[PDB]
Amino acid sequence: YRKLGRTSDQRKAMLRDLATSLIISERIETTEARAKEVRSVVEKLITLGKKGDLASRRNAAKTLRNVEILNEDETTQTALQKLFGEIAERYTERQGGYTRILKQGPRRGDGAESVIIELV
Amino acid sequence: VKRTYQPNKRKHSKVHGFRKRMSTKNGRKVLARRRRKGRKVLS
Amino acid sequence: MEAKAVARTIRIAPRKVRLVLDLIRGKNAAEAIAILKLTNKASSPVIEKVLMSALANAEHNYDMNTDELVVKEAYANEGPTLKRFRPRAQGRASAINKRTSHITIVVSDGKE
Amino acid sequence: AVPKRRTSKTRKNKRRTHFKISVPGMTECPNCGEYKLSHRVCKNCGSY
RNA sequence: AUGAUGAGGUUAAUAGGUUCGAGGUGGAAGCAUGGUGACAUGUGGAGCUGACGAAUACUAAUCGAUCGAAGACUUAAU
RNA sequence: CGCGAGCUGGGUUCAGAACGUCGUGAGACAGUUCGGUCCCUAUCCGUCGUGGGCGUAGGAAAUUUGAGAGGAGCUGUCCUU
RNA sequence: CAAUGGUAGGAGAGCGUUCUAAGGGCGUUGAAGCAUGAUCGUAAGGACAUGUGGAGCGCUUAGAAGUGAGAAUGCCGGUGUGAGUAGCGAAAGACGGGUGAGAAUCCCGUCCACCGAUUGACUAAGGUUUCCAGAGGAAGGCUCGUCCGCUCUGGGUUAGUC
RNA sequence: CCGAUAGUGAACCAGUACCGUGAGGGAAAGGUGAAAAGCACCCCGGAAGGGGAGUGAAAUAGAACCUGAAACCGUGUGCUU
RNA sequence: UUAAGUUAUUAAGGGCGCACGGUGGAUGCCUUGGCACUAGAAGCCGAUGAAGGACGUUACUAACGACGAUAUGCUUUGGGGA
Numbered sequence: 001y002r003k004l005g006r007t008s009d010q011r012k013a014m015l016r017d018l019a020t021s022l023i024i025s026e027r028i029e030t031t032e033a034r035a036k037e038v039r040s041v042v043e044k045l046i047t048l049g050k051k052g053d054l055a056s057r058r059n060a061a062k063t064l065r066n067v068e069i070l071n072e073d074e075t076t077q078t079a080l081q082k083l084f085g086e087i088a089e090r091y092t093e094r095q096g097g098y099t100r101i102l103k104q105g106p107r108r109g110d111g112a113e114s115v116i117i118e119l120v
Numbered sequence: 121v122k123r124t125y126q127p128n129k130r131k132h133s134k135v136h137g138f139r140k141r142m143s144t145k146n147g148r149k150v151l152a153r154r155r156r157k158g159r160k161v162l163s
Numbered sequence: 164m165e166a167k168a169v170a171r172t173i174r175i176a177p178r179k180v181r182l183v184l185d186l187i188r189g190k191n192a193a194e195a196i197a198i199l200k201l202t203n204k205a206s207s208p209v210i211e212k213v214l215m216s217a218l219a220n221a222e223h224n225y226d227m228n229t230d231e232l233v234v235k236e237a238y239a240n241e242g243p244t245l246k247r248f249r250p251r252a253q254g255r256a257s258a259i260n261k262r263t264s265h266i267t268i269v270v271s272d273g274k275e
Numbered sequence: 276a277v278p279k280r281r282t283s284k285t286r287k288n289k290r291r292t293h294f295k296i297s298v299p300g301m302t303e304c305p306n307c308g309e310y311k312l313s314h315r316v317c318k319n320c321g322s323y
Numbered sequence: 324a325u326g327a328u329g330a331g332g333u334u335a336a337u338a339g340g341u342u343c344g345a346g347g348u349g350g351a352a353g354c355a356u357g358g359u360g361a362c363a364u365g366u367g368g369a370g371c372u373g374a375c376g377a378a379u380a381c382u383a384a385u386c387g388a389u390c391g392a393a394g395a396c397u398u399a400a401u
Numbered sequence: 402c403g404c405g406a407g408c409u410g411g412g413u414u415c416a417g418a419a420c421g422u423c424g425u426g427a428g429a430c431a432g433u434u435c436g437g438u439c440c441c442u443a444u445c446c447g448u449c450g451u452g453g454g455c456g457u458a459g460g461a462a463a464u465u466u467g468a469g470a471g472g473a474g475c476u477g478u479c480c481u482u
Numbered sequence: 483c484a485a486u487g488g489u490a491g492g493a494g495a496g497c498g499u500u501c502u503a504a505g506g507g508c509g510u511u512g513a514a515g516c517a518u519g520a521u522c523g524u525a526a527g528g529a530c531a532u533g534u535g536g537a538g539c540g541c542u543u544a545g546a547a548g549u550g551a552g553a554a555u556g557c558c559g560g561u562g563u564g565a566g567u568a569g570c571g572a573a574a575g576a577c578g579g580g581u582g583a584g585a586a587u588c589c590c591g592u593c594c595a596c597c598g599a600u601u602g603a604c605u606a607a608g609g610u611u612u613c614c615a616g617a618g619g620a621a622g623g624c625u626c627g628u629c630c631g632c633u634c635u636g637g638g639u640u641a642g643u644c
Numbered sequence: 645c646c647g648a649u650a651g652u653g654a655a656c657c658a659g660u661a662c663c664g665u666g667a668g669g670g671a672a673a674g675g676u677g678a679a680a681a682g683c684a685c686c687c688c689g690g691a692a693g694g695g696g697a698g699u700g701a702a703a704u705a706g707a708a709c710c711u712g713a714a715a716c717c718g719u720g721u722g723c724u725u
Numbered sequence: 726u727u728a729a730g731u732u733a734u735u736a737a738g739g740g741c742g743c744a745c746g747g748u749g750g751a752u753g754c755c756u757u758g759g760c761a762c763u764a765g766a767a768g769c770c771g772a773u774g775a776a777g778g779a780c781g782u783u784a785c786u787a788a789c790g791a792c793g794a795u796a797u798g799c800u801u802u803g804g805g806g807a
């Protein structure tokens with residue numbers, strides 16, 4: 001696996017935060033290396049969501065941050081609830097994938113290959 | 121480290137300053153040379 | 164026949180601007196623009212604009228349409244350098260030369 | 276640990292023979308015809 | 324180190340994911356029973372499991388571009 | 402008395418101090434004694450690896466002989482006769 | 483007919499630069515400088531032609547000197563090489579939205595993280611306008627910058643009791 | 645006698661930038677054109693720049709502006725490797 | 726065709742000539758300012774507040790001159806001429 005030029009605690013934190021944000025937005029923009037490394041984490045969380053039993057819920061609560069989404073009509077529900085009620089159904093029949101990645105050109109401030117990781 | 125010139129307006133104007141140079145003849149001298157030189161800050 | 168466009172006192176050291184100009188020397192206008200816009204270097208935006216001006220100059224002044232243009236020759240040479248200093252250790256000061264560049268591009272129809 | 280002598284213009288230009296930028300990996304985009312980097316999304320159109 | 328070397332680019336197992344397994348750890352969660360409590364027992368070698376083995380195109384190697392022969396004389400045999 | 406732009410710095414050879422001796426004295430002794438700042442981002446040759454170009458009378462993929470070159474190269478005890 | 487290596491050094495003849503006196507000249511029909519050239523004398527050096535250049539300058543004789551540079555770890559000013567190398571000055575950022583010619587770097591939001599006998603709040607000394615609101619982006623910010631202790635415009639400090 | 649590294653330290657807001665606690669020390673920096681006639685408009689660009697058109701004898705005289713050498717940096721190539 | 730022998734080509738880059746650019750501020754020409762003098766004035770200013778400053782003063786406004794609250798000036802006598 002990759003280290004992302006960062007320590008262990010700071011990476012653990014970055015990976016879980018990036019996975020949460022992806023789950024919120026359903027497509028985000030970042031650099032290749034971190035997309036390649038958040039792919040597995042988000043894919044595994046969705047797996048914890050395709051079962052929905054209380055054990056998997058409690059276990060997926062480890063990674064996701066506690067965030068609130070305001071849906072249409074001022075309806076509110078958290079990241080766990082999204083994962084287990086709006087994304088489990090979408091991928092009940094698909095047996096992998098769950099994500100795609102679309103390389104983009106280098107950014108200006110660096111030569112970093114920005115990419116967009118999106119939930120498929 | 122404590123370097124030199126810990127600034128202080130009062131002591132700056134006491135040890136130096138117009139009235140201090142005007143207190144001794146030698147003080148009167150430096151004003152004399154500084155005017156001969158055409159200096160703008162005399163004391 | 165030949166259209167001219169020049170940018171002066173650009174704030175990029177000439178060694179660095181010339182690295183990008185060593186690619187668009189003698190290529191077609193469209194291919195040249197595609198290189199600049201996709202090469203991920205600092206000088207590239209400033210050159211894509213000198214090229215743009217030349218090409219516009221060509222159309223508006225000579226009726227030289229841009230589909231047949233080639234960067235006949237394109238180069239860059241030194242400019243009025245700005246002298247600065249960096250406070251280094253033990254009271255010593257070293258110099259920093261912020262250089263500049265006089266970018267030139269001429270595009271031709273290959274004709275007379 | 277200091278240069279014992281000057282590096283002449285000949286030696287200088289010789290060392291930097293291999294110091295150059297490569298032309299980008301660009302291919303034409305199938306929806307718009309403008310060039311794009313290969314394996315990247317066209318920035319003019321937004322396709323594949 | 325980079326570049327090289329090597330395994331692969333859909334007519335595809337190259338890597339990720341999914342499924343199964345090896346190895347590691349050691350009895351998950353929730354229940355029910357017993358205890359005043361600190362806890363214990365059954366479910367259930369359970370649960371988890373980075374690189375390790377296999378299968379599967381689910382996701383990404385989609386599109387395209389560049390470089391690269393047409394073979395000299397002379398003499399001797401043929 | 403190989404090797405400090407590879408290392409140490411115990412001895413010795415700066416400034417402090419002290420004992421014995423010499424000098425009226427300041428000080429001194431290759432007499433002791435305790436303490437005492439080891440800088441440098443490698444241009445060239447050299448050396449260890451690792452690429453690109455070109456030549457090998459066509460352009461290539463693979464297997465190669467070996468002109469040379471380098472590496473090893475030590476030895477004990479016991480038993481038998 | 484003889485002589486002609488040469489350092490410390492002695493002697494002699496000269497070439498050049500500025501200025502002055504006189505004489506005689508050249509110059510927008512293009513002077514001095516500058517650049518090029520395959521030209522002339524034994525040397526110091528002298529011309530000629532062609533370009534740039536846009537006003538002064540040669541020649542003869544004679545006078546005077548701040549008169550000739552390659553070295554003084556010379557002085558001043560420019561530009562190299564080392565090299566696209568060292569360095570980028572203690573630290574946790576990620577992502578959505580917006581702004582713009584341009585965004586890892588500016589504004590807003592969520593999450594995360596650091597301090598917390600302090601990176602928090604006051605108040606002295608010292609600095610003086612760095613304070614505030616608009617606007618800008620050359621320069622200064624060790625990168626970028628739409629941002630700022632930067633620049634432009636206009637503002638802001640109220641005591642009988644401190 | 646000197647013509648901008650000279651001649652005052654100072655031809656130019658100079659005993660001033662600046663430096664020092666202070667006595668004190670102490671710079672660097674002249675030249676568009678005859679006339680400002682200082683480049684109306686158009687084109688690319690956010691702007692800086694530029695390219696036309698026009699002013700002028702001249703704009704490689706366009707404000708860093710007379711002449712514009714050398715070091716140094718480039719772009720072509722005839723002959724070589 | 727095959728054997729033997731011989732010789733191009735190459736230029737990633739480099740060298741030398743040449744051409745055209747930049748950078749830079751030598752050189753030439755120029756003078757606003759200096760330097761050394763000559764001849765003649767003159768060779769005392771202050772409590773009547775000096776020499777030197779600081780603040781101010783304009784239609785607007787920083788700097789430099791000039792001026793002082795009568796302030797980017799007032800009066801008067803003469804010179805001159807839009």
Ligand SMILES: [Mg+2]
Pocket residue numbers: 254
């Ligand atoms: Mg210091």
